[PDB]
Design a protein around this motif. Structure first.
Motif, short mmCIF file in Angstrom:
data_model
loop_
_atom_site.label_atom_id
_atom_site.label_comp_id
_atom_site.label_asym_id
_atom_site.label_seq_id
_atom_site.Cartn_x
_atom_site.Cartn_y
_atom_site.Cartn_z
N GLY A 108 17.51 25.19 -55.79
CA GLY A 108 18.58 24.64 -54.97
C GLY A 108 19.02 25.53 -53.82
O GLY A 108 18.59 26.68 -53.71
N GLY A 109 19.89 24.99 -52.98
CA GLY A 109 20.40 25.70 -51.82
C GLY A 109 21.79 26.28 -52.05
O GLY A 109 22.47 25.92 -53.01
N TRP A 110 22.20 27.17 -51.15
CA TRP A 110 23.49 27.85 -51.26
C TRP A 110 24.51 27.35 -50.24
O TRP A 110 24.37 27.60 -49.04
CB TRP A 110 23.30 29.36 -51.09
CG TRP A 110 22.37 29.98 -52.09
CD1 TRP A 110 22.06 29.50 -53.33
CD2 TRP A 110 21.62 31.19 -51.93
NE1 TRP A 110 21.18 30.34 -53.96
CE2 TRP A 110 20.89 31.38 -53.12
CE3 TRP A 110 21.50 32.13 -50.90
CZ2 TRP A 110 20.04 32.48 -53.31
CZ3 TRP A 110 20.66 33.21 -51.09
CH2 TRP A 110 19.95 33.38 -52.29
N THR A 111 25.54 26.66 -50.72
CA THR A 111 26.64 26.23 -49.85
C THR A 111 27.46 27.44 -49.41
O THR A 111 28.17 27.38 -48.40
CB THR A 111 27.56 25.22 -50.56
OG1 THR A 111 28.07 25.79 -51.77
CG2 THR A 111 26.82 23.94 -50.87
N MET A 138 26.40 30.20 -48.24
CA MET A 138 25.81 30.91 -47.11
C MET A 138 25.93 30.05 -45.85
O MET A 138 25.19 29.09 -45.68
CB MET A 138 24.34 31.21 -47.39
CG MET A 138 23.61 31.95 -46.28
SD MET A 138 21.94 32.40 -46.78
CE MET A 138 21.22 30.77 -46.95
N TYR A 141 18.00 30.64 -43.92
CA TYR A 141 17.43 31.41 -45.03
C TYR A 141 18.15 32.73 -45.19
O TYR A 141 18.60 33.32 -44.20
CB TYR A 141 15.93 31.66 -44.80
CG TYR A 141 15.22 30.58 -44.02
CD1 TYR A 141 15.04 29.31 -44.56
CD2 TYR A 141 14.72 30.83 -42.75
CE1 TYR A 141 14.39 28.32 -43.85
CE2 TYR A 141 14.06 29.85 -42.04
CZ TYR A 141 13.90 28.60 -42.59
OH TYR A 141 13.24 27.62 -41.89
N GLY A 142 18.26 33.20 -46.42
CA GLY A 142 18.97 34.44 -46.68
C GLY A 142 18.83 35.00 -48.08
O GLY A 142 17.98 34.58 -48.85
N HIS A 174 21.05 36.55 -51.70
CA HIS A 174 22.27 36.73 -52.48
C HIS A 174 22.19 38.00 -53.32
O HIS A 174 21.42 38.08 -54.28
CB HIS A 174 22.53 35.54 -53.40
CG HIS A 174 23.67 35.75 -54.35
ND1 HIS A 174 24.98 35.81 -53.93
CD2 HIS A 174 23.69 35.92 -55.69
CE1 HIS A 174 25.76 36.01 -54.98
NE2 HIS A 174 25.00 36.08 -56.06
N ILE A 231 19.11 40.83 -56.52
CA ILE A 231 19.00 40.25 -55.19
C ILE A 231 18.20 38.95 -55.30
O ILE A 231 17.25 38.87 -56.08
CB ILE A 231 18.32 41.20 -54.17
CG1 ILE A 231 18.52 40.67 -52.75
CG2 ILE A 231 16.83 41.39 -54.49
CD1 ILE A 231 17.99 41.58 -51.65
N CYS A 232 18.60 37.94 -54.54
CA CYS A 232 18.00 36.62 -54.65
C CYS A 232 17.57 36.09 -53.29
O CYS A 232 18.16 36.42 -52.27
CB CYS A 232 18.99 35.65 -55.29
SG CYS A 232 19.56 36.15 -56.93
N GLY A 282 17.06 32.63 -51.08
CA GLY A 282 17.53 31.25 -51.06
C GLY A 282 17.66 30.68 -49.66
O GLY A 282 17.38 31.35 -48.67
N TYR A 283 18.11 29.43 -49.60
CA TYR A 283 18.21 28.69 -48.34
C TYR A 283 19.55 27.97 -48.23
O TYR A 283 20.30 27.85 -49.20
CB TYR A 283 17.06 27.69 -48.21
CG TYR A 283 16.75 26.96 -49.50
CD1 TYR A 283 17.44 25.81 -49.85
CD2 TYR A 283 15.77 27.42 -50.36
CE1 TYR A 283 17.16 25.14 -51.02
CE2 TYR A 283 15.48 26.76 -51.54
CZ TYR A 283 16.18 25.62 -51.86
OH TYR A 283 15.90 24.95 -53.04
N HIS A 284 19.85 27.49 -47.03
CA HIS A 284 21.14 26.86 -46.73
C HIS A 284 21.32 25.51 -47.42
O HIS A 284 20.35 24.79 -47.68
CB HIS A 284 21.29 26.68 -45.22
CG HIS A 284 22.59 26.06 -44.81
ND1 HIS A 284 23.78 26.76 -44.81
CD2 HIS A 284 22.88 24.81 -44.38
CE1 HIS A 284 24.75 25.96 -44.41
NE2 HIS A 284 24.24 24.77 -44.14
N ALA A 285 22.57 25.18 -47.71
CA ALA A 285 22.95 23.86 -48.21
C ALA A 285 24.36 23.55 -47.73
O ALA A 285 25.13 24.46 -47.42
CB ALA A 285 22.87 23.81 -49.73
N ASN A 286 24.70 22.27 -47.65
CA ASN A 286 26.02 21.87 -47.19
C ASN A 286 26.41 20.47 -47.66
O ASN A 286 25.73 19.88 -48.50
CB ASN A 286 26.09 21.98 -45.66
CG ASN A 286 24.97 21.23 -44.97
OD1 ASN A 286 24.36 20.32 -45.54
ND2 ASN A 286 24.67 21.62 -43.73
N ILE A 292 20.46 20.47 -50.77
CA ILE A 292 20.56 20.45 -52.22
C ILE A 292 21.74 21.30 -52.68
O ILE A 292 21.56 22.47 -53.04
CB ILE A 292 19.27 20.96 -52.88
CG1 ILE A 292 18.04 20.27 -52.27
CG2 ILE A 292 19.33 20.71 -54.39
CD1 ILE A 292 16.71 20.66 -52.90
#
Ligand SMILES: *[C@@H]1O[C@H](CO)[C@@H](O[C@@H]2O[C@H](CO)[C@@H](O[C@@H]3O[C@H](CO)[C@@H](O)[C@H](O)[C@@H]3O)[C@H](O)[C@H]2NC(C)=O)[C@H](O)[C@H]1NC(C)=O
Ligand SMILES: *[C@@H]1O[C@H](CO)[C@@H](O)[C@H](O)[C@H]1NC(C)=O
Ligand SMILES: *[C@@H]1O[C@H](CO)[C@@H](O)[C@H](O)[C@H]1NC(C)=O
Ligand SMILES: *[C@@H]1O[C@H](CO)[C@@H](O)[C@H](O)[C@H]1NC(C)=O
Lengths: 321, 164, 164, 321, 164, 321
Positions: free
Chosen positions: C12-15, C17, C22-23, C25, D3-4, D6-10, D320
């Motif tokens: 899944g994605g990160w709300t 960020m 891309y980044g 955590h 450290i992870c 990941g990608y953007h979500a909204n 997602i």
């Protein structure tokens, strides 16, 4: 003590082309190109086409003696001419806006022939019995069935005036003709008047015709000519004929409702009771696919025509047994 | 292959697996057999099914009579009419040809991708509990029964059980 | 995903960020938070921006009045004119629809690719100094402060530093 | 410590379609299809369209009595007709090459109306006062403003000859008409000459007209007809009218410079002072996008018309949350 | 890069290698030099040659006279004829422009793909007999002469001969 | 010891555009767009074009005194007019269906001019010596070479009848004309008859022409006009001219086999002996590539015309030296 990752393979001989490589064998594929027809001329949108038999549209409309129709069908989704339609205007001359008339009659949902100007009661002051050897039925000189040839009665041709009001609640197609004698002697012989003219008019149509007299090569034995004219009379509108001679009068006319966006197909393929959404001169085809190589000229809802011999779309994966 | 799996490090396909596009071949004490992964296969099918339906159904078709008739003084617009028909012919032929060529390549690459994704989906769970031979085969450092094999296929495999 | 990263092993994605596509955590002694890799994000932006502009700007048209008028004896060229307009409609609609379908697929794969590329650049640097969990996370076997985290994000991470 | 990657979500609800999967929710997207118009008819290439009000192009040119409150500019980039333009030729008959004239007048950069044959000094021996109930304005019989109905003055219609040389340094549009009585009695009642004719000629134009006399159905109460003819006179060229009757003479003419590649729009949308590069009958649109679903018929530099309700291009990645 | 090798972890190309698109740089006791992989290079050539030929040869053209002449009472069909010609111009320009942009992108990714495939083709055979330095270089844990080098290129290299 | 995996690089400055990135430098590339022409007009299908020199198709056909005749080739694949072809019909009037006739003559096989009605033996009862200052040759009044002007002999113009049967086994193109005097007095001065006609007919062709007399502006010094008419006579068919005056008689005619699907090019470019499959007004181009930006209007098997200044296809990979 082993688990393996692999992919499917089979007996499939199917081959497709890719941008990088030709003739890749795949396990499964689908065909995007329609390569086949049924070799028949079928009903379009549930309606059969008009079949004219020995005659073309000109001969059929004008009522050429060789055209056998007890009734013209009530409707057709398109018109079929064959190599056997050889009989058009049997009296030599020009059919004006013939291509246009054909296009506009390509599909009709209501077609009836009726007597617009009855032969018996219409022309008391003129002689209606004129015939010609160029138009012959059963070895005897005859004339068009849907037209009437008006000539002088007892050395006189009084000015005639005749009108028809359209109560049919639909478009009435009115055909008539103008006769052009080869000599001035013949002009006076038939219509008695050298100064003669024909005038036809309605709300949306007006025109005038004068006999063009000239020596011409014999066509079907005649140095004379006959030009044919038509107009589509609107519901409620009136059409009026005035002539001092040279008029070939309407006898029968046609009342109709025009369809749209149809055409004429020329093919010797047999007409049958089947149905199709796409008709080609070679035969009907199934329209479910996006492309077809059968023929560029079609009538219906049809796949786009391409010259491609093969369009095959890989579904499965490269086959490696 | 673009992803290097099909006709890649995995050299060939299995005629013995008829129930799916991608799958597993297990070998152990109890026996041997073929099993297809239904998730990756169904996902691929749904994807390819959507591709085929897109190419066909995006085509809009109206009732049209292509044919036109012209007399001998109308020749210019007859050839104009011909240029139109031929123009649409040149366009549709060229685009269709490449559309098939290009998407056939992508379809084959799509399968190549799925095989690799499955491979490295399995590798990640086994980790060092198995040895990587190649040709898409993993040799277990332990004994794996039919229940354990299914654990791998379902992706539910339990790492902190089999270590030795 | 084609490259198996987005909706892949990374689920899944990160709300949380907001500063990039891309980044990373990080979680350590000092705290936890989100940080976006600006190189991979900016490169993606530049690419997609050129893609959108290409689709839009390659379209150039000449001044044209589509409408045409015909009388009741001109029906044939009226239908010819209609075939032209309808033909261009059939061509442009079909192509536009697919152009979006195909490039939407390519765009998502471009993102999918970039995420995986970022992941294995990090895997390449950490090596055995961290544990590969799956899910796109690396658990450190040593102490990593915000200075150490930034070294990984900056691509400057020092392997012959942590034997520990 | 961890450290992870990941990608953007909204919270984005935007959805796009792909070849493999329908209705995918994405974080960001752009629209390639123009779905909106301003509901106005605007200026093309910096110039406003011609507004004909109650009249169509025929009525405007001929000077139909209902067209005399119109305010026309020196130039226009296209022509606007509305559902309210009902006033054409008020006198029944054919407008010859009417569609062509409309096409050719679609855009002009210099437009002036001027008096080609002045009413007072041109026709001393003919009556210019003729009117008709068919052309009535405000319940009173009237006639075209730009033409003159020439009838006999006191028992005779002398042969008239009038010529105009074009000094305007640009094309002069000359319109005229020919009147056809239903009966010969009316012919002599008006022009006295049964043999009457109209002849018009220039460098690029030559024609002759004779009154066609015959009974026709009444249109707007008239069994008579009036046909309308036009020609574009080149700079330096001369046009000459000769008639013994049945001529509807030019009064006013038009001097102009034709543009190119424009057309006519039929719309009830209001004309405003705004500007656009693309005009549709529904309203003006933004031409920045490649595609538009606004209208199949456009005038300008325009996005291609498509049947698509939605074209949406994924920019971002799968959302997602 | 889409596959992350070219302009990827492998940073640059070798001007010293003219005999192929992809290749190897060998260095050992006996010497150093450049050698091109013939299998991957020839396949890529065949592929690209097939792509270019497809784009050019799928275009079929009929003898056509585009020009048409009309008089001043024919204005409508002259503009109809212009609409046809302008329409084909808008279509062919737009499609050609995008066709090149899109396939150029695919071509470069195809090269990117081939390099990685070659890389992990070598990695797969060597396994732990060599160390992964990065930038596409492998350090042998054993001695490798020119005879051993050719084995890597030929794909015939023997891992269980070299634990040494 | 070390082995490394890598890719090709060179000094190549070639650059391409991609959807993601502009101006990527690649090792190798191919060009899909032909940007160059040879500046010459070459042979199509192995045959040179028809060159009309100082005259246009009208002047060549009618035999304008300023043109070159009998030097016409047996065949041509297309027609070249230059900016210097200014000499058309020197006698003012309308050439009927002029554009159509041009199209059908665009390419012909087996082309010969012959004398259909020889000046000496054809017209014994009429005067053939008529000339005009409007058609000048070498500063002296002359006439068309392929036509003959028939005027009255000794105060009489008897009804003439002349026919030609086509035995040539191919289509015969017959051109003729009808002269229209400015005044009725001149009509009687030349042709002697106030009531006059020209009648032309064949199997597939019928028409009549009458002398329309009217005052018109002087063109090339003449208030008179001459209209030019033509027909393609089928093999075996007869054409018959009858006139009481006003006929400009056929002198020379043309026998031919028409080609198809060719056209006319207007260019000042020099014609040479080279060959090409595609000809543009600017010059010949290579038809091997799919696209060309030289010109939208071409004749041949040609690349599709595009607005692209650059179409360049990457073959190699990104160059990184
Ligand atoms: C309906 O079509 C048929 C044939 O398609 C017409 O029948 C006859 O067709 C032949 C041509 O094969 C004509 O030949 C002529 O024969 C006469 C001797 O009878 C000869 O003198 C001529 O030189 C020519 O060879 C024949 O005229 C024609 N029949 C008639 C009665 O003229 C038939 O005419 C068509 N129906 C109508 C009403 O035209
Ligand atoms: C049309 O009917 C079905 C649906 O595509 C198919 O089985 C059949 O073959 C089609 N017709 C032809 C001629 O292919
Ligand atoms: C056309 O021919 C006439 C005489 O036949 C001549 O005076 C005139 O100069 C020619 N045209 C040109 C452009 O020279
Ligand atoms: C077109 O030019 C010549 C034709 O003489 C041909 O040899 C060449 O290969 C063609 N150009 C290209 C780019 O293929």
């Amino acid at each position: 003590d082993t688990i393996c990752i692999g992919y499917h393979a089979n007996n499939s001989t199917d081959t497709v082309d890719t941008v990088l490589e030709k003739n890749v064998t795949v396990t499964h594929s689908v065909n995007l190109l329609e390569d086949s027809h049924n070799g028949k001329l079928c009903k379009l949108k549930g309606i059969a086409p008009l079949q004219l038999g020995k005659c073309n549209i000109a001969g059929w409309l004008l009522g050429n003696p060789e055209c056998d129709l007890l009734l013209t069908a009530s409707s057709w989704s398109y018109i079929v001419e064959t190599s056997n339609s050889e009989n058009g205007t049997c009296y030599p001359g020009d059919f004006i806006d013939y291509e246009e008339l054909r296009e506009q009659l390509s599909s009709v949902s209501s077609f009836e022939k009726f007597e617009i100007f009855p032969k018996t009661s219409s022309w008391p002051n003129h002689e209606t019995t004129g015939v010609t050897a160029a138009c012959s039925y059963a070895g005897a000189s005859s004339f068009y069935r849907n037209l009437l040839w008006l000539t002088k009665k007892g050395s006189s041709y009084p000015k005639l005036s005749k009108s028809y009001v359209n109560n049919k609640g639909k478009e009435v197609l009115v055909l008539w003709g103008v006769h052009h004698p080869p000599t001035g002697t013949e002009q006076q012989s038939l219509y008695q008047n050298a100064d003669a003219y024909v005038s036809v008019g309605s709300s949306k149509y007006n025109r005038r015709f004068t006999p063009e007299i000239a020596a011409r090569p014999k066509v079907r034995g005649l140095a004379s000519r006959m030009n044919y004219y038509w107009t589509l009379l609107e519901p409620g509108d009136t059409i009026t004929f005035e002539a001092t001679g040279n008029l070939i009068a309407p006898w029968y006319a046609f009342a109709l409702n025009r369809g749209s966006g149809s055409g004429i197909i020329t093919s010797d393929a047999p007409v049958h009771d089947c149905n199709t959404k796409c008709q080609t001169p070679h035969g009907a085809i199934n329209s479910s696919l996006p492309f077809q190589n059968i023929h560029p000229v079609t009538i219906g809802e049809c796949p786009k025509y391409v010259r491609s011999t093969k369009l095959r779309m890989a579904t499965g994966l490269r086959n490696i047994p | 292959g673009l992803f290097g799996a099909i006709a890649g490090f995995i050299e060939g396909g299995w005629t013995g697996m008829i129930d799916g596009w991608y799958g597993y071949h297990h070998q152990n004490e109890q026996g041997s057999g073929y099993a297809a992964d239904q998730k990756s296969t169904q996902n691929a099918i749904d994807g390819i099914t959507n591709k085929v339906n897109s190419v066909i159904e995006k085509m809009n078709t109206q009732f049209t009579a292509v044919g036109k008739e012209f007399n001998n003084l109308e020749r210019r617009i007859e050839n104009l009419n011909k240029k139109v028909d031929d123009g649409f012919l040149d366009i549709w032929t060229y685009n269709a040809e490449l559309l098939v060529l290009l998407e056939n390549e992508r379809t084959l690459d799509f399968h190549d991708s799925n095989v690799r994704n499955l491979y490295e989906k399995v590798k990640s769970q086994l980790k060092n509990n198995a040895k990587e031979i190649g040709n898409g085969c993993f040799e277990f450092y332990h004994k794996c029964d039919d229940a354990c094999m299914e654990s791998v296929r379902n992706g539910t495999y339990d790492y902190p059980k089999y270590s030795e």
